[PDB]
């Protein structure tokens, strides 16, 4: 078996370029909880906030377009539809509100969560919504009639995150009981349970192509192949915890933001960490306020947007020089257990 681990030095994974800080956008009165980008045109992005607003930022120039009020408590998660001109926002005030983009007003409230709802996922093909929160369940809403059609009972604790996939398991959910469940919605029961995490799973991201899912915990970032549900890879991590956010670029780049401010880029295929950064917090902030609460890659995949606990948005750009002049990353040491 280790004869293979002798050959496991033959891969030498996939060089990638280093990431650097292009621009910093202030302008939010609270923390920036969540970020979503225009799925079609990469023209602008939306930003949840502690201060209850949402602001639409112009992506090219970083200027501000319009602000969207309408929640009385923080806005935890945000989704913008590929197929619709709709913005779905969700808050800690137990409410899930649609936003018709053409007129920029509220359209449809979705009612019937018990307590705060921290996540929204739009099903790709079905005109459904998936939301979940401290209530420990997922509700699948008919987007047109605002009916909580299907309620997926499951995790024994608050659900942190929710994803949607077109084929089987259509709903991936990750709660604080350290279980990532893969749901069968038509039968309303769990297809497969992934227990390998030690503690609460605070972030999950879907790969734009490969059809797999990444999960995160304190020290551990795993991956999982959907369908079967098998473990695929692991990601090498020294104690980086807490992992708040994962995002996957088209290029097999995997970003993991921390609560220590340390940004950690990986290589999705290998599980190698090819860089680490630390944000420079802000002028008058505290060392406690240096962290990363969200993230995304735009559709091109060359620019990363992460809102941070210092009330700032930072757009992280990939270096054009790069290659192997001096890129070389943390340089591939496969330590053993």
């Amino acid at each position: 078996i280790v004869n293979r681990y002798e050959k496991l030095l033959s891969q030498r994974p996939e060089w990638h370029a280093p990431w650097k800080l292009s621009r910093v956008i202030n302008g939010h009165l609270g923390w920036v909880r969540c970020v979503a980008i225009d799925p079609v045109d990469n023209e602008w992005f939306i930003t949840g906030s502690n201060d209850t607003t949402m602001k639409v930022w112009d992506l090219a120039t970083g200027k501000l377009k319009t602000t969207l009020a309408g929640h009385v408590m923080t806005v935890r998660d945000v989704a913008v539809s590929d197929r619709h001109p709709y913005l779905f926002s969700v808050s800690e005030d137990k409410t899930v509100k649609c936003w018709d983009l053409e007129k920029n007003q509220i359209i449809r409230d979705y009612y019937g969560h018990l307590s705060g709802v921290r996540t929204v996922s739009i099903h790709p093909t079905l005109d459904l919504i998936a939301t979940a929160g401290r209530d420990s369940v997922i509700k699948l809403w008919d987007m047109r009639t605002r009916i909580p059609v299907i309620t997926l009972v499951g995790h024994k604790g608050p659900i942190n995150q929710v994803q949607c996939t077109p084929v089987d398991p259509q709903v991936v959910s990750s709660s604080t009981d350290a279980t990532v469940r893969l749901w069968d919605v038509v039968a309303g029961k769990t297809m497969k349970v992934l227990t390998h995490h030690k503690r609460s799973v605070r972030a999950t991201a879907l790969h734009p192509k490969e059809f797999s899912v990444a999960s995160a915990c304190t020290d551990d970032i795993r991956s999982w192949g959907l369908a079967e549900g098998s473990l695929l890879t692991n990601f090498e991590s020294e104690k980086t915890g807490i992992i708040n956010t994962l995002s996957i670029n088209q290029d097999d780049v995997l970003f993991a933001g921390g609560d220590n401010g340390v940004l950690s880029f990986y290589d999705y295929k290998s599980g190698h960490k090819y860089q680490s950064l630390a944000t420079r917090e802000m002028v008058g902030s505290l060392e406690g306020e240096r962290s990363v609460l969200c993230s995304t890659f735009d559709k091109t995949g060359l620019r990363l947007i992460t809102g941070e606990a210092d009330k700032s948005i930072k757009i992280w750009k990939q270096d054009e020089t790069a290659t192997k002049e001096s890129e070389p990353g943390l340089a591939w040491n496969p330590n053993l257990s």
Binding site: I1, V2, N3, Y5, E6, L9, L336
Partner: protein, 280 residues
């Protein structure tokens, strides 16, 4: 009996009311599950523990206690079937295995633990776990078994310090050939292991000594000389090597500076003098 009946009833109102409110706080479950035991009713108590496994199954004090109440009254195949559910739920754990192993000791059945350690080794647990399996066969014999134990055991930890316990104990068998057999295999396997593995720590001064002192027990002058040459090959009247070991160590002493290197030049030159004369 009403001096009893209303006692049991009033208690079951108070305990459930609290657990009704707090699903968590296992401290109450075990207490209340203990109350129904001391009433000599196993049916209720088993329900309580089973009710309390739903709340949290990762809490081992609950798991352990619910082994006790089964063992104390000696309900065997329950505390037996339970251990099917117990260690298949939390297979990593330490305490759950040993409490299942050590309770199988007092039942005198070594066939069970033989197959227990089969799986518990198949799971590749780690140091302290394996050592209980190798040392258990010291209680038993399995001298043909124990050799195959370390067969798999250094497949789980392909590291040198575990080989040290193989070469240690395989002498204690009282067979020199079986012991020697793997040193030539330590030539073949380790070198093929280590050289093709960049780098898992294998060849250290402590491995070469394991070859060395082996031949001292068999009193071989040549088979030691093979080692030095074979080792020094792959490293990164009879007082000749006394000078060679001293002179190499003298030059081996690092010398940063001018006077430090010139001080060392006095040492190795005297060593060369007393004992490539042009290149020195």
């Amino acid at each position: 009996l009403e001096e009893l009946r209303e006692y049991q009833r009033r208690k079951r109102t108070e305990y459930e009311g609290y657990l009704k409110r707090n699903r968590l706080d296992m401290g109450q479950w075990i207490r209340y599950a203990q109350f129904e035991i001391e009433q000599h009713d196993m049916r209720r108590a088993r329900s309580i523990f089973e009710r309390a496994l739903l709340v949290d199954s990762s809490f081992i004090p609950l798991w352990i206690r619910y082994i006790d109440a089964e063992l104390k009254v000696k309900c065997i195949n329950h505390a037996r079937n339970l251990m099917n559910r117990a260690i298949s739920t939390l297979p990593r754990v330490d305490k759950l295995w040993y409490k299942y192993l050590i309770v199988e000791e007092s039942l005198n059945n070594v066939e069970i633990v033989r197959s227990l350690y089969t799986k518990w080794c198949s799971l590749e647990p780690g140091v302290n776990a394996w050592n209980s399996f190798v040392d258990f066969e010291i209680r038993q014999k399995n001298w043909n078994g124990v050799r195959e134990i370390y067969s798999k055991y250094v497949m789980a930890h392909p590291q040198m310090q575990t080989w040290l316990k193989w070469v240690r104990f395989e002498n204690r068998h009282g067979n020199t050939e079986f012991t020697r057999s793997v040193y030539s295999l330590a030539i073949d396997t380790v070198a093929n292991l280590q050289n093709l593995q960049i780098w898992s720590d294998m060849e250290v001064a402590k491995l070469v000594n394991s070859f060395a002192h082996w031949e001292a027990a068999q009193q071989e002058y040549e088979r030691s000389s093979a080692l030095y040459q074979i080792a020094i090959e792959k490293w990164p009247x009879x007082x000749x090597x006394x000078x060679x070991x001293x002179x190499x160590x003298x030059x081996x002493x690092x010398x940063x500076x001018x006077x430090x290197x010139x001080x060392x030049x006095x040492x190795x030159x005297x060593x060369x003098x007393x004992x490539x004369x042009x290149x020195x």
